[PDB]
From a paper:
The most noticeable differences of domain structure between PUF60 and U2AF65 include the lack of the RS domain in PUF60 and a highly extended linker connecting the second RRM and UHM in PUF60. Although both U2AF65 and PUF60 are general splicing factors, the PUF60/U2AF65 ratio in cells influences alternative splicing patterns, suggesting PUF60 is implicated in alternative splicing. PUF60 appears to promote splicing at a weak 3’ splice site.
The similarity of the dimeric interface of the unbound protein to that found when the protein is bound to dAdML3’ indicates that the propensity for dimerization is inherent in the protein before it encounters nucleic acid, and the nucleic acid enhances this propensity to dimerize such that dimerization can occur at lower protein concentration in the presence of nucleic acid. None of the residues in the dimeric interface are close enough for hydrogen bonding, except for the amide nitrogen of each Val-202 donating a hydrogen bond to the carbonyl oxygen of Val-202 of the opposite subunit. However, in the unbound PUF60 RRMs structure, most of the residues in the dimeric interface are not close enough to hydrogen bond. However, in the absence of nucleotide, PUF60 RRMs does not dimerize, and neither does PUF60 RRMs+UHM.
Residue numbers in the entry: 99 to 145, 148 to 178, 182 to 275, 277 to 294
The structure:
Amino acid sequence: GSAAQRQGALAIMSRVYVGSIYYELGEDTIRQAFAPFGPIKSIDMSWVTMKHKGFAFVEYEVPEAAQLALEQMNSVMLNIKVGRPSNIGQAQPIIDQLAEEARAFNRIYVASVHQDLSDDDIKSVFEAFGKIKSATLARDPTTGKHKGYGFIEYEKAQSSQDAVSSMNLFDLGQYLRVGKAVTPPMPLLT
């Protein structure tokens, strides 16, 4: 896949269809509900009877997030149906290419991480499951503070599995959202 194609596959893989949305709910509600999985980049909710259509397309900044929201979102809110944009099929080959590639790094995604924790803490907390090759938390450029999520590459596959199975929904005051990475480190490259 070309640098551009991979950049377009990642974009689609971060989109999640949300349906059965009560008519009295707006993007702010949806946003808050899915935020646990990674900061929400944008929301595309389609609205002469200015009310909407109870479906939205939430777009995360990284596909790993979309992957988790889909696995953990089957809550009420007014019930809702989660799925994927029916056009991913056009980027499926690459998406599969990114999947195959991802399996070479015992890479894991970690969302909903408290502002006070740092790359160290997270590292500290996670190395308990195995030697950690890399441990970094995404950060805001204009600030520098982590965006509440990051990635952790383990030395051993077993280590990343133990980490995942043990930390998904781990406390404190919030619940961490963890799951295996669905993409390699530099997706647009090769």
